[PDB]
């Protein structure tokens, strides 16, 4: 969960990351707004946001080169299909924070 996220994210390519934490505030705004809402009501009620959450990881993956190189390595699209329960969705929301905190640990 958090042990394998410190080594896979560091192993990249050329240094000096030109991507900051402000240009990726589109695909990260729905994951933070879903964990706090799924803990109140049930999971079978919110059906319009689950299908729309997967689109953000595909539409934004062909408009920037600093996005496709991170999804294929961290395997984001694979975890979007295994989830199906409300308790399982809570685990994927905590793993997304590892790709943001550890990303600015070596630079910004």
């Amino acid at each position: 969960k958090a042990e394998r996220a410190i080594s896979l994210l560091e192993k990249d390519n050329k240094g000096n990351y030109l991507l900051t934490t402000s240009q990726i505030r589109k695909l990260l705004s729905l994951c933070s707004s879903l964990y706090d809402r799924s803990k109140e009501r049930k999971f079978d009620e919110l059906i319009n946001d689950v299908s729309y959450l997967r689109v953000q990881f595909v539409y934004q993956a062909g408009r920037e080169i600093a996005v496709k190189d991170l999804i294929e390595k961290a395997q984001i699209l694979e975890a979007l299909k295994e989830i199906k329960d409300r308790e399982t969705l809570q685990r994927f929301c905590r793993y997304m924070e590892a790709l943001v905190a550890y990303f600015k640990f070596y630079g910004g």
């Binding site: 707004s33 706090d36 809402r37 109140e40 319009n48 924070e97 943001v100 905190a101």
Partner: protein, 212 residues
């Protein structure tokens, strides 16, 4: 003798305002000015401390004859409505607010909204260069109701000044609509509007005379 008058109203936000919550205490999204919400659910709630301090501020500048140097010490006609920490005659006030919650969730989900609070992007100019320090804030939705209940009670002895106190509460609520409420309202974010201003009796000991 001793009654419990309740002034039920619906606070309709004609313009999205901002309320500074508990910074550096929430989750990973503690930036972009975190707005205080519900500690259990996600429905944004408005605190009652910002209402008692703002209503008393606008009231202590038109119904007085001396500049207030320190709190809990200004005139006397309005000190018994909110309280007084330096007076020896009266201590407990006669106005009790309530942390109103967003009760507009019965029809807000039917329109299909993204989130309860959005993030607005702003910046500033140093008057010597272009864009500098790209900051960001957080606001709420527009046209949302709130269950606001005013717990009013008399101390039996203060019975000959009932009609005189009604014109003060009505003047304070109407004047509050023409001023920003919360925080960062200088740019035009506050300005509330009390909708459906009515009164009722819960304990049942005083007649019903006022309404609007």
């Amino acid at each position: 003798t001793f009654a419990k008058i309740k002034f039920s109203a619906q606070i309709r936000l004609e313009t999205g305002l901002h309320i500074g919550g508990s910074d550096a205490f929430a989750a990973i999204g503690a930036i972009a000015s975190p707005v205080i919400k519900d500690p259990i659910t996600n429905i944004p709630i408005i605190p009652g401390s910002s209402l008692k301090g703002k209503m008393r501020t606008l009231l202590a500048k038109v119904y007085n004859e001396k500049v207030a140097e320190k709190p809990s010490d200004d005139s006397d006609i309005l000190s018994r409505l909110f309280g007084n920490s330096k007076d020896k005659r009266f201590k407990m006030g006669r106005l009790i607010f309530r942390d109103a919650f967003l009760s507009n969730a019965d029809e807000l989900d039917s329109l299909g909204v993204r989130s309860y609070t959005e993030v607005k992007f702003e910046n500033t100019i140093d008057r010597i260069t272009a864009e500098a320090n790209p900051r960001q804030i957080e606001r709420a939705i527009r046209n949302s109701t709130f269950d606001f209940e005013l717990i009013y009670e008399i101390t039996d002895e203060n019975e000959n000044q009932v009609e005189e106190d009604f014109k003060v509460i009505r003047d304070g609520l109407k004047l509050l609509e023409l001023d920003y409420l919360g925080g960062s309202g200088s740019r035009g974010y506050g300005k509330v509007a009390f909708e459906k201003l009515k009164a009722t009796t819960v304990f049942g000991n005083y007649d019903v005379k006022t309404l609007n």
